[PDB]
Amino acid sequence: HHWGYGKHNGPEHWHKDFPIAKGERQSPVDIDTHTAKYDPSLKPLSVSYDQATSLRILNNGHAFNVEFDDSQDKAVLKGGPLDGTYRLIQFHFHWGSLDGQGSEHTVDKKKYAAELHLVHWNTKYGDFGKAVQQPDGLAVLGIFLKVGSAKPGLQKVVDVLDSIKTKGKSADFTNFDPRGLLPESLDYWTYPGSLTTPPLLECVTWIVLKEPISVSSEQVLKFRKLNFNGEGEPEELMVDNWRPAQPLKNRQIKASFK
Ligand SMILES: [N]S(=O)(=O)[N][C]C123[B@]45[B@@]67[B@@]89[C@]1%10B81%11B698B746B814B562B%10%1143
Numbered sequence: 001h002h003w004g005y006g007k008h009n010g011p012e013h014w015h016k017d018f019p020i021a022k023g024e025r026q027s028p029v030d031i032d033t034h035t036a037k038y039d040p041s042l043k044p045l046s047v048s049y050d051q052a053t054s055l056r057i058l059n060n061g062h063a064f065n066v067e068f069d070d071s072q073d074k075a076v077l078k079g080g081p082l083d084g085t086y087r088l089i090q091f092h093f094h095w096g097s098l099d100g101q102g103s104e105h106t107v108d109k110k111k112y113a114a115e116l117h118l119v120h121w122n123t124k125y126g127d128f129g130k131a132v133q134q135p136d137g138l139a140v141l142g143i144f145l146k147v148g149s150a151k152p153g154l155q156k157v158v159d160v161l162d163s164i165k166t167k168g169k170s171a172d173f174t175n176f177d178p179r180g181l182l183p184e185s186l187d188y189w190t191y192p193g194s195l196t197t198p199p200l201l202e203c204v205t206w207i208v209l210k211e212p213i214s215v216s217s218e219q220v221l222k223f224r225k226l227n228f229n230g231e232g233e234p235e236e237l238m239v240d241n242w243r244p245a246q247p248l249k250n251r252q253i254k255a256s257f258k
């Protein structure tokens with residue numbers, strides 16, 4: 001009875017194994033655009049992905065991760081609300097069964113079709129596993145996806161999904177450039193939060209871009225052909241792998257823009 005996204009093991013249940021699920025800085029949250037305040041203290045955001053080295057893509061039974069070599073300073077996120085240098089370790093998505101749902105963060109309660117998470121760790125902590133135990137251990141860059149035109153820089157990801165349909169399957173995924181997943185603007189909201197999957201640790205500075213990327217219906221339909229189950233098991237399509245918005249509690253969402 002492992003955690004997942006169904007009736008019996010979904011987000012409503014996670015607090016039994018992971019009591020921090022009802023904690024003071026859980027993610028995702030609704031971003032109320034009228035209450036978010038412009039913060040002149042935020043430095044410019046720096047997303048330096050030119051030297052990123054992808055290694056592999058993996059179906060972990062809740063999503064797929066595109067993994068990077070993080071053994072040196074190649075693809076880093078700096079600036080904005082962050083102190084120091086955060087190294088890219090992987091990205092993954094959350095998505096829906098229908099185009100009207102799928103994102104984790106919401107914007108004035110609007111749900112997007114999906115949400116990309118580029119996960120980075122604070123190099124002052126030496127490794128990811130140490131970083132997740134710190135309040136400023138991780139920075140996750142969140143990008144909304146809406147359905148419209150195709151995102152060409154996503155298609156390499158879409159085209160390998162057939163090879164990792166079921167839980168535990170992985171595939172070589174070198175030379176993927178995550179710059180092709182970024183929108184034009186780096187305007188963002190930022191707040192302190194958590195991992196949105198177990199273990200739900202409260203170690204993330206969230207940086208959520210205002211501008212969504214557009215992906216095609218055909219692209220998102222291929223995400224929805226993945227399976228939560230492993231090979232040879234009854235098919236459970238990998239859809240609706242998102243946690244809903246959690247209580248904002250004693251937090252302020254800051255905007256980088258006027
Ligand atoms: N939606 S999230 O970015 O909060 N998920 C973070 C993850 B992914 B899955 B579970 C938590 B552990 B494994 B791997 B590692 B990273 B961290």
Ligand SMILES: [Zn+2]
Pocket residue numbers: 092093094117196
């Ligand atoms: Zn995520």
